[PDB]
Ligand SMILES: Cc1cc2nc3c(=O)[nH]c(=O)nc-3n(C[C@H](O)[C@H](O)[C@H](O)COP(=O)(O)O)c2cc1C
């Protein structure tokens with residue numbers, strides 16, 4: 001499965017659509033729950049300085065014990081022009097949890113990012129068996 | 130007709146997010162200690178110094194235009210009053226960026242060098258051409274095209290010169306100056322994202338015909354600016370043999386600029402594989 | 413045509429002086445803890461609370477106008493490129509001022525109370541008239557007259573509302589919110605001086621005929637704005653019985669606005685003897 005988050009700009013939401021994998025979105029308002037294991041795809045939204053960088057809607061979704069238990073991996077989106085903050089939201093989720101850091105990409109991702117995440121996510125799901 | 134802004138009623142929550150990040154990232158060139166780069170600066174040849182001076186003056190030109198003309202011209206085209214307030218911050222911080230280069234110049238270079246670098250910006254046909262292109266659309270009467278030209282400046286035109294500070298940092302030279310530039314690049318990224326975000330919001334208000342006319346305009350303007358930037362890059366980096374790598378950086382950022390406007394990346398991976406030492410200097 | 417700004421060669425050293433002061437005085441509404449004034453706010457009557465809201469909302473309109481339209485419209489009329497950079501900072505800081513009032517509103521008043529203050533600002537004929545006046549010259553094609561309207565706004569129109577926060581502070585009420593206002597007034601003083609200073613510099617470039625025409629316009633515009641401010645002040649301050657002193661404060665600031673433009677004070681000393689407790693509150 002795939003659980004992703006995107007703000008009003010939907011740069012991450014449009015990348016998940018180009019992926020072609022069915023995925024569920026963390027809503028901008030309210031809480032949700034997932035039953036099957038999933039991989040998280042979230043963008044970074046930090047500033048100056050691991051306190052923050054993660055969207056508040058994702059914090060609420062991850063504060064849910066039932067949702068956090070089924071988290072298997074994290075793929076972060078962002079922009080290399082942010083210096084050391086480049087996709088640091090995935091570093092925060094990977095460090096403060098036991099999940100690994102699968103992939104990084106910028107904004108909507110290039111055509112190579114979609115092919116890289118599809119093949120990588122397929123080989124990662126076969127690893128969970 | 131005007132009407133006092135109510136920050137307790139936001140029509141677009143993204144406006145507050147960008148305002149908080151930009152104002153929270155406030156900085157001035159005095160925050161970066163450029164004095165420690167005096168030894169490293171002295172280890173550059175006369176040609177290496179001249180290249181850095183001209184590249185920096187070229188960045189000042191884009192900062193002077195984007196702050197004095199660019200950001201201000203977007204205010205009447207705002208969708209919300211908070212977008213107007215955010216735009217005033219961009220215009221100011223752009224002036225801070227342009228002044229930061231003069232602080233670097235004052236700390237490292239002599240008066241004769243600075244005058245030669247600024248005189249070069251006046252006569253360089255490629256630098257003047259790229260300014261005339263965006264300025265015509267900043268001062269025009271097509272609001273959506275203006276946002277495309279503005280985003281292309283923040284996400285593409287700047288990075289032809291942003292390469293050098295990262296190149297020097299990769300060689301353990303002018304490290305503090307690179308930290309100064311990194312503060313600018315961090316700000317530019319948010320500007321290009323925000324102005325591009327607002328461009329997409331305006332795209333949803335027009336018809337399908339206008340949407341296709343704007344996609345053609347973006348590709349035409351990108352390549353017109355790219356053809357001018359490749360000539361600009363040759364005249365500067367050909368002496369140091371960095372032209373081919375800067376061109377990769379140019380194509381790499383041109384794809385980013387397109388994604389800010391909602392369009393897909395155009396150049397393949399084999400044409401944007403910039404030297405990893407430069408990318409490590411960014412992040 | 414544009415030309416990257418060279419901060420190492422200033423045609424007017426005042427531009428760097430004003431830039432250093434304005435940027436060095438940078439602040440944000442989050443720096444002032446307005447929450448401590450909640451107890452004091454509860455001791456205000458329904459009319460006294462509403463009076464503070466209307467005064468603050470009216471100030472927000474002037475700040476919104478000066479940041480979105482006023483300061484940016486002065487950029488094409490600048491004499492030096494550094495004057496342009498200073499104006500971008502003023503345009504941004506003016507937006508910070510407008511946000512400060514929304515921050516105060518959020519901490520002390522309710523949503524229904526805040527909406528009433530903004531709905532009143534849309535319908536108040538005196539507040540709308542003063543806004544229409546400055547907007548007419550901001551959007552016109554007379555550069556020197558535009559600078560006169562800006563100076564009268566920074567040095568005269570604002571202080572009709574600045575009286576109340578100083579009045580509360582002089583009575584040990586809403587002290588923290590008054591500290592926020594002192595930060596705003598600190599910026600306004602430099603703005604009125606700078607815009608008025610540049611107005612005087614432009615006066616030396618025209619002939620004596622135009623110079624006399626602008627002195628006539630200044631006295632005429634001051635009289636139009638003053639007569640409108642007394643009606644604005646009466647409708648607001650008549651309930652609390654502060655009208656007689658606000659008019660003294662108005663003449664006190666009208667003299668400041670005139671002197672900022674290089675003209676002599678108009679009201680005598682016995683006509684500007686504002687309450688000493690209010691003048692001490694501005695210290
Ligand atoms: C206020 C703000 C802060 C950001 N900070 C970072 C950052 O620290 N690191 C990074 O890689 N990208 C950063 N970004 C870029 C976003 O993560 C990027 O545009 C992402 O694709 C946004 O995802 P979305 O449009 O789907 O919501 C930031 C963007 C904004 C608006």
Ligand SMILES: [O-][O-]
Pocket residue numbers: 434435437501502503505506599
């Ligand atoms: O402060 O402008």
Ligand SMILES: [Mn+2]
Pocket residue numbers: 192222223226227313317
């Ligand atoms: Mn810049």
Ligand SMILES: [Mn+2]
Pocket residue numbers: 195219223283316317320
């Ligand atoms: Mn910028």
Ligand SMILES: [Mn+2]
Pocket residue numbers: 475478505506509596599600
């Ligand atoms: Mn103000």
Ligand SMILES: [Mn+2]
Pocket residue numbers: 478502506566599600603
């Ligand atoms: Mn002001």
Ligand SMILES: [O-]
Pocket residue numbers: 188189192226227287313
């Ligand atoms: O820059």
